[PDB]
Amino acid sequence: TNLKADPEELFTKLEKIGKGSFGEVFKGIDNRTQKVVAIKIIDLEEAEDEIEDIQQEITVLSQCDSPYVTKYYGSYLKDTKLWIIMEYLGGGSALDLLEPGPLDETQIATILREILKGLDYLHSEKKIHRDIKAANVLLSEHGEVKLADFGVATPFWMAPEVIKQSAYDSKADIWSLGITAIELARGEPPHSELHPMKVLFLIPKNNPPTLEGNYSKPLKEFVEACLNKEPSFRPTAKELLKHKFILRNAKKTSYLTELIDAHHHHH
Ligand SMILES: Cc1cccc(-c2ccc(-c3cc4cnc(NCCCN5CCOCC5)nc4n(CCCCN)c3=O)c(Cl)c2)n1
Secondary structure (H helix, E strand, O other): OEOOOOHHHHEEEEEEEEEOOOOEEEEEEEOOOOOEEEEEEEEOOOOOOOHHHHHHHHHHHHOOOOOOEOOEEEEEEEOOEEEEEEEOOOOEEHHHHOOOOOOOHHHHHHHHHHHHHHHHHHHHOOOOOOOOOHHHEEEOOOOOEEEOOOOOOOOOOOOHHHHOOOOOOOHHHHHHHHHHHHHHHHOOOOOOOOOHHHHHHHHHHOOOOOOOOOOOHHHHHHHHHHOOOOHHHOOOHHHHOOOHHHHHHOOOHHHHHHHHHHHHHHO
16 A cells, blocks of 8 residues: 555545445546546544455456456545545445346346356456455446445345355355356345345355246356355356356347446436
């Protein structure tokens, strides 16, 4: 992190665009390029126990160089405040884009395909995302789909072995992807009506969720593949990129601008 430069001279801070982990997130302008950025400001006086978690996510982001992972531009310390500068993605999150109404299976398949490309990248780099969910999938204004908000190394997207504090690996991300597929299809993850502490024992106790409703059998099978209780029975991200649901239904990401437009016109 840069300790000399004054982030308030380098960036113009604009409106809040999100409640982030450990701090609020603002739309900002890079004053030298006039590009829009996302700025997370964390008060390190008021968030002291979590500082190592913040450092860990910065480290992981700084090691990533993929079209499918939100870019990290650096961080600055001013008085007690840490400014973290990231790529601004103007389409908003996939969770945002569920608000006007249901996605169609081409949109679901396209978003899942792009998430899978990001997971393929991370897993090939021996990284685990750890918090795959629609709120952490961001779209550019062109429809590009990228991962953000890595989990630290709410239970609804957690694999059973993560909850049982077993040794887990990248297959935990594949379970979370299955939950995210249900969320993209239905609007909410399984058990969304229940208190989190009940969900904490239901996920290990119960059979895995299934996708309920009038969805194509390939989509239900995609979900069932990801949501195996046994991690070794879950496919890899590489394998899932060849799943018939993806191959039959995914299309150009640029088509997702229609989804972004529907969210803009809805508001
Ligand atoms: C602790 C730690 C360590 C290292 C890094 C970070 C860290 C994590 C995430 C981000 C972040 C980036 C980001 C980019 N673009 C966007 N666009 C939203 C546009 C919405 N508009 C609404 C109006 O209509 C148009 C669309 N939002 C971003 N958000 C907010 C959303 C988070 C979703 N989970 C970020 O939180 C940053 Cl900067 C740093 N954290």
